[PDB]
C-alpha cells in the first residue's frame, strides 16, 4: 500500500483517502482464504482503526530500552486487524458442519487471555515478546 | 485554635518545608496534576512552591542508552564550565 | 489529558547554553530567538530553531537550551524511525523533514517513536531567517 | 586482590532494593511505567521509617549482602606478601594461632634478628 | 462520530441528540458483523449508558501515578459497550445449529469475572491492565 | 427516570406513583434483549423492591473508609434487579433448543455464590468490591 | 528458484518478478499434497511476505555467538511460509467428513504458542532451538 | 541407490540425474505399503531434498566426541523423508472410515515436538539419541 | 587505512582531534575508518553511495553486533578516499568503505571538508562537519 498500515496513527487512518484505506483493508483480507466477504466495509474499517489504536497505546513504548514490538511492525498490525476481525465474525470456529460434510479444527482451546483466543491474535502475540514482562530501570 | 494542618500554621512544620524539598528534588515539571496527588498537593500547598524540574538532579544527569565511556550518571552542573 | 512526561529531556551532552525566555516554556519544546539571546516556541516550515528547552520557565526568565552537538528526548507528532530528519512542528513537538516544507532538518532520529511518542535524537544543526 | 575485594565490598558489602513491578503472567509493564514507580521508592528521596501502602502486585524485593570472607582473603595476601618479604606475619597487622608466645614465637623472632 | 464516545460523561450522553447518540451506536454497531440487528434501540443506548458510567466510576483513577485506563479510551468504552450488548443477547454462543448447518466457536472456560466471559470484554481488559492492582503509595 | 432508582429506598419506592415505577421498570427491562415480556408486572416490581432493599442492607457502608458500592449505584441496582429477574425465570439459559434450531451459551461455571450465578449478577458484582474484605480500623 | 527464499529480505520479495515470486511459490506449494489450491495467488504470496520479514524480525540476530537460526533457513522460511498459509485456510483440520468417508489426524497441538499449532510450525521451531533461550553474555 | 541418500548433500542432491533422484525416490516409497502414490513426485522430491538438509544442519556434528546421528545415515535420511512426506499429505491417520469399513489406530496422542508426531519421525528419533543433550566439554 | 615504513604496514589512528566520540551497535561486520549511518534504533550500518546516510566514522573493528564507537561531526579524521580531492572540497561517504567529493557524487551538501588533499586511494585528512539522514 501506499501508505503502509504501520506508518499511519489513528488521526492519520481518518485523514487517508478511501483508495488508501481499501489498500490495506485488501491486505488485511489476504491473512484469510474467505477474506471475510460477508463481513462489510465499515467492520473491516472499524477493526482495522482498533487495531491501529491498540498498536500505538497497548503495544508501543520500550521495555528495559528495547522496543516493545519487536517484530515487524506492518505484520503485527496486519495481525491484530485479523484478530479484530475474526472476533467481529464471532470468533474462531472449532467446528463446521452442514451438506458439505464436517471439518473440526486443531484449537485446543489452552487459550484464555484476549490474544490467545484466535490464530491471528498468537501470531501477532509473538511480535510482542509475547506479552512477557522483561522492563529494567535504574537509580543514579 | 491552629492545628498543624491549619493554613495559618504551615509555615511553622518541618515536615511543610521538608517535603516541599522532596517536592523540587523530585519532579520533571510544572504540571503538578500529573506528578502528585490531590492529597501532596492540598497539603504542602505545591502551587506555590517553584516546581518546574530545575532543581531535580536528574535533569542534569546522562542517561545514554550504549554507555561505551562509563558515563552515565554523570552530572552537567558539575563541568569545569559551569 | 494525562499530559504524561516523566521525562529527562537530556540523553548525553555539555553543550548547554543560557538565553531569557521571551514567553512561558516547558521541558523538551524546540524553540528560537524572538530577540537579543531572548528564545520563544519554534513556528513551522524550518526557519526557526536553535535547540530544545531542558525545564519549564515562566517568560522573563533564565533558560538552560540543549543545543546542537546534543542528545534529547523529544515528542513527535508523527510516527518517526532512526534515520529520519526532524524539525519543529510548530505545535511544540518535532515532525519529519519529510512531512514539513522544508529541505533539511535540524535533529536526527536515533530510536524511532510512534504519533505522540517521545523519540531519541541528536540535534545537530540550527535554522534562521534566511529570507 | 586488594582491588578485587573493594570492589566486591561495593557490589555485594550493601543490600539493594529490587521493586518488581506487575502479576506474575500477568499485564506487562513498560520502561515509563517503571519511571512512575521509581519515583515513589527513589533511594535518595527515602528515608529510615518510610512506610509502603499497595495492590497485590508491587513486590519490595531485595538483593541481600551476599556474605563472602574478605577478611580471610586479606590475611592470606597479607601471609604471602609478609613472607615473601621475610617480614614477620605481624609486621602486617594479621596474627595466627599458637605463634603468639614460646618456642614458637622465640624461633620467628630469632629468624628476624 | 462528532463527540467521540471518550468525551462524554454519563450526563453528556443523557445531553446528547439524537443524531449524536446514534452515530456512536452505529459505531458500537461495527463490532459485530451481525451488528445486534435484532435488539432494540433502548437496550444499545442503555449498554452505552452504562459503559460510560462503569467507565468514569470503575476504570478511572490512577494506580501508582500511572492511569488505570491505559488503553485508547475510545475503543476501550465501545469494546465495554459490545460486552454489555452480547450479555443483553444472553452472553457469548459456544455452538449454533439451524438446518443441519451447525458451527461450534473456540470461546471455552475463559473465566469466571465479568470481562474474562465474553469477546469483546476480553479485549477490553488488556486496556485496563487487566483488572491488575499495581497501585503504590509512600508516607510523607 | 425522574427519580432514579439510586435515589429510593424501599419506603420510598412503595411511596412512588405506578408512572414512576414504570420508568424504573422499563429501565431495567432495557437490560436484556427479550425485555423478559413474559414475566408480569409485579414480578418485577418485586425484583427491583428486593433490589433496593438488598443494596440498602447488604451492599451498603464503609470499608476502611470508602464506599462498598464502588461503582455507579443506579447500574448496580439496575443490575441487581436484572439478576433477580432472571432468577425468578429460572436461572440462565446454558443450551435452548427447539423447532428453529439450538444454540448453548459460553454461561458454565458460574461459581457457587448467588451473584456468581447470572451474568447480570457477575456485572454487579464488580460495583462492589467483588465482594472482596478490604476493610481496616484501628485503636487509638 | 533462482533466487532462493533465504536470499531474499522484505524489500527484495517486492523487488521479484512475478515468475521469480511464482517460482518460489511453487516450492511452498509443494509442502502440501493439497498445494492449497484454492486459495488465491495474493494470498500465498502475502504468506511468504510475512515469512520473509518474521524471519528476519524475530528469528534473527545471535544467542551466546550461535546464531538464533541454526537449521537451514531455505527450508526454515519455507515451512514458516506453510505455516502463514496454513492458518489463513483455519487450522489444521483435527478431522475431516463427508460423502466420501471420513478420518481424524492426531493433530493435537503441542501447546498454546503459534508455531505449536500446526505440523509446519511444529517442523520450523525444530530450526531455531524450539523457542529456547540460551543468550549468555558478559561484562569486559 | 548408485549413490545412497547419506552420501548426497543438498547441492548434490540438486546436482543428480533424474534417475539418480528416481532410485531414492523409490526407496522412500518403500516405507509405506501405500507409497503415497497419490502424491506428485516434486512433493516426495521436496520432502527429500528437506530431509537431507535437515540431516546436515539439524541432525550433524557431535556431542561428548560422539556422532549426534548415532545410527544408520542410510535409514535416518530415509525415515526423515517418509515424516516429511507424511506430514505434506497432512499427519497421521488416527482412524479412517467410508464404505469398506473402519479402522483405528494406536497412534495414542504422542508428544509435543516434530519427531514425536508421527511412526517414521518416531523410527528417526531413536538414531539422534531421542533428541537428548549428552554433550560436554572442557578447559584446559 | 595504512602507512608504509619499510617492511610494516602501521595502521593510521583515524581520530586527529576532537571528543565527539559515541557508542552505537554494530548491524554488520565493520571495520576501522568506515562511514556509517543509523540503520536501526541505535544501530549502525556501512554507509550508501549518496546522501542521506552518515553519522560518523567507525574508529575500530567489530564484528556484527559489537559496540562500536564513531567519531562524529566536531571531528578531524585521516579516512580513505577512492578519488582525487583538494583543500575546500566537500566529501561525502562513498559507498565501497571510501569518501568521494560532493562534486563527484549524485548529492548537493557533503558530511565532511578536506582540510589535507590526497590522490586516489591515499589517506586524506578531513573535518567532519554535519550529519546525513532520511529527508524523503
Ligand atoms: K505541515
Ligand atoms: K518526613
Ligand atoms: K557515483
Ligand atoms: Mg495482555
Ligand atoms: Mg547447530
Ligand atoms: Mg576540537
Redesign the interface.
Known amino acids: 500500500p501506499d501508505p503502509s498500515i504501520?506508518?499511519?496513527?489513528?488521526?492519520?487512518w481518518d485523514a487517508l483517502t478511501t483508495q488508501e484505506q481499501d489498500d490495506i483493508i485488501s491486505?488485511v483480507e489476504?491473512?484469510?482464504?474467505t477474506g471475510w466477504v460477508?463481513?462489510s466495509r465499515?467492520?473491516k474499517?472499524?477493526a482495522i482503526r482498533?487495531a491501529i489504536?491498540?498498536?500505538?497505546?497497548?503495544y508501543?513504548?520500550?521495555?528495559?530500552?528495547l522496543?516493545?514490538l519487536?517484530?515487524?511492525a506492518?505484520?503485527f498490525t496486519?495481525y491484530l486487524s485479523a484478530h479484530?476481525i475474526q472476533?467481529?465474525?464471532?470468533?474462531?470456529?472449532?467446528?463446521?458442519?452442514?451438506?458439505?460434510?464436517?471439518?473440526?479444527?486443531?484449537?485446543?482451546?489452552?487459550?484464555?487471555?484476549?490474544?490467545?483466543?484466535?490464530?491471528?491474535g498468537?501470531?501477532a502475540?509473538?511480535?510482542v515478546?509475547?506479552?512477557?514482562?522483561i522492563?529494567?530501570?535504574r537509580?543514579? | 485554635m491552629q492545628l498543624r494542618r491549619s493554613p495559618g500554621m504551615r509555615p511553622m512544620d518541618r515536615d511543610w518545608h521538608q517535603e516541599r524539598a522532596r517536592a523540587r528534588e523530585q519532579a520533571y515539571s510544572s504540571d503538578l496534576t500529573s506528578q502528585f496527588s490531590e492529597s501532596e498537593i492540598v497539603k504542602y500547598e505545591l502551587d506555590t512552591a517553584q516546581i518546574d524540574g530545575s532543581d531535580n538532579p536528574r535533569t542534569y544527569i546522562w542517561n545514554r542508552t550504549i554507555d561505551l565511556f562509563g558515563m552515565n550518571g554523570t552530572d552537567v552542573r558539575e563541568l569545569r564550565n559551569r | 489529558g494525562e499530559h504524561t512526561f516523566p521525562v529527562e529531556v537530556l540523553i548525553s551532552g555539555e553543550e548547554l547554553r543560557g538565553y531569557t525566555a521571551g514567553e512561558a516554556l516547558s521541558a523538551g519544546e524546540p524553540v528560537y530567538l524572538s530577540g537579543d539571546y531572548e528564545v520563544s516556541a519554534s513556528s513551522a516550515d524550518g526557519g526557526e530553531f536553535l535547540g530544545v528547552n531542558l525545564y519549564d520557565v515562566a517568560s522573563g526568565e533564565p533558560v538552560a537550551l540543549a543545543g546542537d552537538d546534543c542528545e534529547v528526548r523529544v515528542e513527535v507528532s508523527e510516527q518517526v524511525t532512526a534515520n529520519d530528519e526532524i524539525l519543529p512542528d510548530g505545535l511544540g513537538t518535532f515532525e519529519t523533514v519529510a512531512t514539513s516544507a522544508a529541505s533539511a532538518g535540524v535533529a536526527i532520529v536515533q530510536e524511532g517513536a510512534a504519533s505522540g511518542e517521545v523519540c531519541e535524537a541528536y540535534i545537530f544543526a540550527v535554522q534562521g531567517t534566511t529570507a | 586482590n586488594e582491588a578485587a575485594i573493594n570492589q566486591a565490598i561495593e557490589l555485594h558489602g550493601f543490600p539493594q532494593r529490587h521493586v518488581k513491578v506487575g502479576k506474575e503472567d500477568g499485564a506487562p509493564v513498560r520502561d515509563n511505567d517503571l519511571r512512575r514507580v521509581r519515583t515513589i521508592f527513589d533511594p535518595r528521596t527515602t528515608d529510615a521509617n518510610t512506610a509502603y501502602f499497595t495492590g497485590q502486585d508491587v513486590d519490595v524485593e531485595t538483593l541481600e549482602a551476599h556474605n563472602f570472607d574478605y577478611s580471610a582473603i586479606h590475611e592470606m595476601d597479607m601471609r604471602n606478601l609478609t613472607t615473601a618479604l621475610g617480614l614477620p606475619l605481624e609486621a602486617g597487622n594479621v596474627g595466627a594461632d599458637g605463634l603468639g608466645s614460646g618456642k614458637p614465637a622465640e624461633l620467628r623472632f630469632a629468624l628476624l634478628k
Chains 1, 5, 6, 7, 8 share one sequence.
Open positions: 504501520d506508518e499511519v496513527s489513528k488521526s492519520d491486505q489476504n491473512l484469510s482464504s460477508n463481513t465499515e467492520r474499517a472499524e482498533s489504536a491498540e498498536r500505538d497505546t497497548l508501543s513504548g520500550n521495555m528495559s530500552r522496543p516493545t519487536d517484530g515487524d506492518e505484520y496486519l479484530k472476533l467481529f465474525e464471532g470468533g474462531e470456529a472449532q467446528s463446521e458442519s452442514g451438506e458439505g460434510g464436517s471439518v473440526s479444527y486443531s484449537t485446543g482451546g489452552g487459550g484464555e487471555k484476549d490474544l490467545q483466543k484466535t490464530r491471528y498468537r501470531m502475540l509473538e511480535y515478546w509475547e506479552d512477557n514482562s522492563a529494567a530501570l537509580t543514579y
